[PDB]
Amino acid sequence: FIFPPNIKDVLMISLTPKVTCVVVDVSEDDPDVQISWFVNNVEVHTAQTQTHREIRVVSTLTILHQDWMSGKEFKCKVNPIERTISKIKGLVRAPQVYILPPPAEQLSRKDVSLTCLVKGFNPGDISVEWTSNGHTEENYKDTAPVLDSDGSYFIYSRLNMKTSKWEKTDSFSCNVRHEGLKNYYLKKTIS
Amino acid sequence: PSVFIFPPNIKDVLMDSLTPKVTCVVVDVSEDDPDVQISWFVNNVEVHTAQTQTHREDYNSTIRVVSTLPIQHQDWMSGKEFKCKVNPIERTISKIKGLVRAPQVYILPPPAEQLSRKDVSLTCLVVGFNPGDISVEWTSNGHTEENYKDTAPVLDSDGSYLIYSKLNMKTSKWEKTDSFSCNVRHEGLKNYYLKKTISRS
Amino acid sequence: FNMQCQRRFYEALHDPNLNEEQRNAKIKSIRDDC
Ligand SMILES: *[C@@H]1O[C@H](CO[C@@H]2O[C@@H](C)[C@@H](O)[C@@H](O)[C@@H]2O)[C@@H](O[C@@H]2O[C@H](CO)[C@@H](O[C@@H]3O[C@H](CO[C@H]4O[C@H](CO)[C@@H](O)[C@H](O)[C@@H]4O[C@@H]4O[C@H](CO)[C@@H](O)[C@H](O)[C@H]4NC(C)=O)[C@@H](O)[C@H](O[C@H]4O[C@H](CO)[C@@H](O)[C@H](O)[C@@H]4O[C@@H]4O[C@H](CO)[C@@H](O)[C@H](O)[C@H]4NC(C)=O)[C@@H]3O)[C@H](O)[C@H]2NC(C)=O)[C@H](O)[C@H]1NC(C)=O
């Protein structure tokens, strides 16, 4: 099982994108797994390989942002089983981003839900985060991307907070990262 | 050939009007010996009401045998065990008994920035429920609305689930229609049902 | 949010007048300087 870099790591220059390779069906008694890595059929050697057991091996290769956006191949040979991967050149739609205030009948609770609706995007790889007055907000969950009737994706994110914070805080921000966006970054803010 | 067993649909379980059914599926049956004998056991007591049929799976050129046992709502909810025996292969399914917490249901109106356009999204927020099996559907003062998509249930840090549903319509319809309703079915609600309504005006 | 380096990154990633060797160097400079 081979895996692409996290979309946020790829789009942000301040982050380190990693292609991951995981080996299934491995015993605890013979754990020596030799894993090689190739970038466009050229062997690289900077891969981090740690072990785990249920046994599976997670080999992590660090990659250049541009080399994934340019769609180079990334194969990991295992001994031999070989899995490659790259970025699909597909349709690209940028996301529409809306913030929905809490439902009125929730404003008499202890907690309120701030909802971010991000829709109409292609491909389905997206990153949604929350801030308030520039500080990181950690108390949130998001749905998986869902395919919409028109062939695009939408996602909801719910930032959960004490009602005190909702009433006393100046602003909250939905921060979206997607390849359809200029600079791969957009910030929507509500007061 | 392997065998799989599937729980009934939650909407079939909660609605008395609908018949829930357990389903036993035998995949990768051979064309040479299509003889698959499948028997059903409710609490080790054999039942004889299941309808069996064979399916050609054009995806990969294989054959599939699927057995569907119609069950009664009470037996499933009381945690009775259901077992299909295929010849021998045995598979057992029973309702997972655990925490039961009713969902709270909210309808978020379209975002203001979307009212300038010609389509709008209506949002149903469903939070704090256990177990994660739930049914969400939309109506227009009773009439079925179909242009909507749900999300999968998501595990909150609370330990409960939340789910969203998006109903799409034209802005004109959103102004002309009297009201819309998010209808939720869950085992934690009174009568397994709850209806939230919103109106534009 | 460091909008500057991200925007330099983005602009350099799509700059037509740069070859793959010069692209990687510019990106590495932006990436390392910030
Ligand atoms: C030829 O093709 C067929 C068809 O392929 C399928 O259809 C095509 C069109 C493509 O989309 C394929 O991608 C797709 O898979 C192949 O037949 C498939 O074979 C696989 C096995 O390799 C079966 O996988 C199992 O799937 C169940 C879940 O099954 C649902 O979801 C499937 C989509 O993933 C879907 O195909 C199924 O139809 C089924 O869908 C549900 O169906 C019911 C009844 O009709 C319906 O009411 C529902 O609404 C509907 N829901 C949805 C969402 O569609 C999964 O649970 C299985 O996992 C168990 O078994 C694994 C071992 O195989 C094991 O590793 C797992 O851990 C897990 O083990 C279970 O664990 C639990 C608790 O942990 C335990 O209680 C269980 O006892 C235990 N079970 C076992 C056996 O240990 C598994 O992943 C597909 O169901 C099957 N598809 C069909 C249609 O039959 C076929 O393999 C191909 N042939 C060749 C040679 O390639």
CATH number for the domain harbouring residue A118 = 2.60.40.10
Claim to verify: residue A26 and residue A66 sit in the same structural domain: yes
Please name which of A115, A124, A116, A119 lies closest in space to residue A95, comparing C-alpha atoms: A119
Q: How far apart are CA B108 and CA B85, in angstroms?
A: 48
Claim to verify: residue B109 and residue B88 sit in the same structural domain: no
Claim to verify: residue A67 and residue A91 sit in the same structural domain: no
Claim to verify: residue B53 and residue B86 sit in the same structural domain: yes
Claim to verify: residue A118 and residue A155 sit in the same structural domain: yes
Burial C1-34 (b: 16+ CB within 10 A, else e): eeeeebbbbbebbeeeeeeeeebbebbeebbeee
Q: This structure's resolution (angstroms)?
A: 2.7
Q: Which residues 6+ apart lie within 8 Å of B194 measured at CB? A: B103, B105, B183, B184, B185, B186
Claim to verify: residue A106 and residue A77 sit in the same structural domain: no
State both tokens at A64. 């250049």
Find where tokens 């018949």 sit: B19
Claim to verify: residue A99 and residue A179 sit in the same structural domain: yes
Which residues of chain B does A147 touch, with a Cβ-Cβ cutoff of 8 Å? Answer: 149
Ligand 1 atom at minimum distance from B7 CA: 47
Closest Cα to atom 50 of ligand 1: B6
Claim to verify: residue B107 and residue B45 sit in the same structural domain: no
Claim to verify: residue A34 and residue A46 sit in the same structural domain: yes
Claim to verify: residue A54 and residue A138 sit in the same structural domain: no
Domain finish residue from A86, A104, A128: A86
- How many structural domains is chain A composed of? 2
Claim to verify: residue B108 and residue B154 sit in the same structural domain: yes
Positive or negative torsion for Cα B70, B74, B76, B79: negative
Q: How far apart are CA B13 and CA B19, in angstroms?
A: 7
The reply to whether residue C6 touches residue A13, judged by beta carbons under 8 angstroms, is yes
Task: Select the residue of B123, B147, B150 nearest A149 (Cβ to Cβ).
Answer: B147
Distance B150 CA to ligand 1 centre (A): 22
Domain finish residue from A58, A86, A114: A86
**Is B116 an 8 Å CB contact of chain A?**
no
Domain finish residue from B43, B76, B94: B94
Which residues of chain B does A152 touch, with a Cβ-Cβ cutoff of 8 Å? Answer: none
Q: Which residues 6+ apart lie within 8 Å of B189 measured at CB? A: B102, B103
- For residues A116 and A131, is the Cβ–Cβ distance under 8 A? no
The residue range of the domain holding B79 is: 1-94
The reply to whether residue C2 touches residue A64, judged by beta carbons under 8 angstroms, is no
Q: Which residues 6+ apart lie within 8 Å of B56 measured at CB? A: B63, B64
Task: Select the residue of B106, B123, B150 nearest A105 (Cβ to Cβ).
Answer: B106
- For residues A144 and B152, is the Cβ–Cβ distance under 8 A? yes
**Is B168 an 8 Å CB contact of chain A?**
yes
- For residues A146 and A58, is the Cβ–Cβ distance under 8 A? no
Residue type (1 letter), B107: I
Query: What does chain B look like in DSSP terms, one character per residue?
Result: -EEEEEPPPHHHHH-TTS--EEEEEEEEE-SS-----EEEEETTEEE---EEEEEEETTTTEEEEEEEEE--HHHHHTT--EEEEE--EEEEE-------BPPEEEEEPPPGGGTTSSEEEEEEEEEEEBSS--EEEEEETTEEE--EEEPPPEE-TTSSEEEEEEEEEEHHHHHHSS-EEEEEE-TTSGGG-EEEEE---
Claim to verify: residue A182 and residue A113 sit in the same structural domain: yes
Please name which of A37, A55, A58, A54 lies closest in space to residue A46, comparing C-alpha atoms: A37
State both tokens at A104. 């009125």
- For residues B136 and B150, is the Cβ–Cβ distance under 8 A? yes
